[PDB]
Structures are given as structure tokens and as C-alpha cells.
Amino acid sequence: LPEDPRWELPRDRLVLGKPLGEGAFGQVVLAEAIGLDKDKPNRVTKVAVKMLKSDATEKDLSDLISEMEMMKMIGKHKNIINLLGACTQDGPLYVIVEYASKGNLREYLQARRPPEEQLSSKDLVSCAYQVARGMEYLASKKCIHRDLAARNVLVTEDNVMKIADFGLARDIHHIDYYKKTTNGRLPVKWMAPEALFDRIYTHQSDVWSFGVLLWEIFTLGGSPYPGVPVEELFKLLKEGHRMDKPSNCTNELYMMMRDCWHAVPSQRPTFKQLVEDLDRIVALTSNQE
Numbered sequence: 519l520p521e522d523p524r525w526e527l528p529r530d531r532l533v534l535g536k537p538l539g540e541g542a543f544g545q546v547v548l549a550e551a552i553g554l555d556k557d558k559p560n561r562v563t564k565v566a567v568k569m570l571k572s573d574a575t576e577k578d579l580s581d582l583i584s585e586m587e588m589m590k591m592i593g594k595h596k597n598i599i600n601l602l603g604a605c606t607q608d609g610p611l612y613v614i615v616e617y618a619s620k621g622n623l624r625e626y627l628q629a630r631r632p633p634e635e636q637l638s639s640k641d642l643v644s645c646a647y648q649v650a651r652g653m654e655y656l657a658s659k660k661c662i663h664r665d666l667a668a669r670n671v672l673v674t675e676d677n678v679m680k681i682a683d684f685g686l687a688r689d690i691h692h693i694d695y696y697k698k699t700t701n702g703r704l705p706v707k708w709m710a711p712e713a714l715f716d717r718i719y720t721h722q723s724d725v726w727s728f729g730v731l732l733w734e735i736f737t738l739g740g741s742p743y744p745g746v747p748v749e750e751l752f753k754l755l756k757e758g759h760r761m762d763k764p765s766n767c768t769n770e771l772y773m774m775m776r777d778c779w780h781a782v783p784s785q786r787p788t789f790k791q792l793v794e795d796l797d798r799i800v801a802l803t804s805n806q807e
């Protein structure tokens with residue numbers, strides 16, 4: 519691998535810890551990084567580290583590198599999972615990014631359903647706002663996420679939402695429409711029709727996915743189209759079906775979901791617009807229920 523001193527961390531400054539997840543991407547572990555900031559060389563920072571599995575191919579390496587390189591280019595934002603450093607020399611590739619201690623947004627919402635304190639309506643709108651803000655930043659850097667969903671939003675110790683996995687390499691022509699998430703759900707349920715049917719990914723199709731994520735927020739981690747298999751989903755979308763309004767959701771916020779699901783991509787709102795609308799809605803939202 520080519521040396522890049524902008525990002526290199528000596529690997530004896532990385533104390534590897536417990537796993538966070540394994541799969542086709544390799545494996546991710548929690549870790550402690552000693553002297554990340556050159557200012558404080560005696561401070562440890564909890565971080566997450568991605569590395570390759572043992573039986574990993576030359577393409578597997580190339581995908582991890584392009585993911586690291588994409589993060590380098592995109593730059594930093596409060597509401598995305600930021601690259602912190604890399605271990606690339608004399609050993610296995612380690613890609614180091616911010617650690618979000620409260621896990622993904624789907625799990626976080628589900629743990630706070632009434633029978634870990636319940637979320638106020640302002641907490642929920644503010645969650646949406648922060649995700650929209652991350653996507654606004656990513657879109658401004660010309661980044662199309664392609665798999666925006668609550669499972670790909672991570673929550674920090676301080677309840678900050680961070681978009682994850684915006685830099686993954688995907689061959690969209692090799693998507694397995696039938697492949698489930700570890701949770702048993704079908705990622706096709708977050709795709710715009712023009713991405714699902716025609717493989718056309720845009721900022722406008724990420725806005726479609728954001729609408730689904732909004733629905734996940736206000737159902738507190740609900741599963742979209744529960745029990746609906748791929749073939750029937752295709753039919754629903756061909757017919758123009760749209761998910762029902764969640765209970766505990768204003769008509770204004772449901773109108774936002776429906777606009778994100780506009781049949782015509784050019785007529786959906788932009789993330790810039792959604793940020794402005796959500797900002798207005800946060801201010802007007804009662805944190806008393």
C-alpha cells in the first residue's frame with residue numbers, strides 16, 4: 519500500500535478490543551488509540567477499526583482502500599462517521615473511524631419504546647434533522663449514499679446522529695434483491711422505484727430512502743412493509759402504494775414523508791430543503807410529550 523502520512527497511525531498506538539461486527543466487509547473491532555491528536559499524546563480515544571478477513575481477495579482489499587480513500591476526500595462533518603486514521607504499513611490494513619457508543623438508530627429507537635427513557639416528540643424530530651444534515655453535507659460533496667436507512671445511522675454517547683457507510687464500494691449490478699439484513703429485513707424496501715427497477719441512483723433516490731427512514735423514526739424502529747416479499751413489493755410500487763401514516767406523527771411530518779416518496783424524482787424535496795423544514799419543525803415542536 520502507498521504511504522500517506524496525512525493519516526498514518528503507528529500500529530502500536532492501537533489497542534485492539536472487542537468485535538463490533540463481521541461480514542463481507544471483513545470485521546470491525548472496538549479499539550483504543552493512544553495519541554491520536556498529536557497535541558495530547560497520552561490520551562486514549564475509543565475508535566472503531568475495520569480490517570479484512572483472512573480468506574479475503576484482492577478485490578476485497580481494493581474495496582476497503584477505495585472506501586478509506588473516499589472518506590479522505592469527503593472531509594469532516596458532525597453528522598457522518600469520520601475517518602480518523604489508518605494503519606497501512608508493515609501489516610494488515612486498518613481503517614480507523616469515530617466510535618458511536620450507542621449503536622445504530624433502529625436499535626436505539628426500539629429500546630426506547632414504551633413497555634431507558636422514552637423519546638419526546640422533539641427528540642424524534644431532532645433525530646430526523648441531524649440525519650438530514652448529514653445527508654445535506656454528503657450531497658454537497660456529490661456523494662450518493664445508495665443505502666440510507668436507520669440501520670446505517672449511528673448514535674454517539676451524546677445522542678448525535680452520524681451517517682455511516684456512505685463510502686462503501688457497491689457494484690449495484692450485483693445486488694441480491696432477496697438478501698436480508700442481519701435483522702431479517704429486505705434493503706429493497708428503502709430504494710426509490712427508479713433505483714429498484716432501473717438501477718438509477720441519484721440524490722433524489724436518497725431522498726426517497728430518507729422518507730422511509732423518517733417513517734422508521736416515527737414508528738420507533740418499525741419494520742417497513744412487514745411480511746411483504748420482494749415480488750409483492752415490486753407490485754406495490756408499480757401500483758403507487760405508499761406506507762400509512764404512523765401514529766404519533768403529525769400530518770406535516772407525514773406530508774414530508776409522502777413528498778420524499780414523490781413518483782417523479784424531480785419533484786421530491788432536496789436535503790437542503792428538508793434541513794430547512796425540519797429546523798422549522800424542531801423549533802415549533804413540544805418537548806412536553
Ligand SMILES: Cc1ccc2oc(-c3c4c(N)n[nH]c(=O)c4nn3-c3ccccc3)c(C)c2c1
Pocket residue numbers: 538539540546566567568585599613614615616617618619620621622672682683
Ligand atoms: C470503515 C469503518 C471502520 C470502522 C467501522 O465501525 C462501524 C461501526 C460502528 C461504529 N463506528 N461505532 N459504533 C457502532 O456501533 C458501530 N457499528 N459499526 C458497524 C460495523 C460493521 C457493520 C456495521 C456497523 C462502521 C460502519 C465502520 C466503518
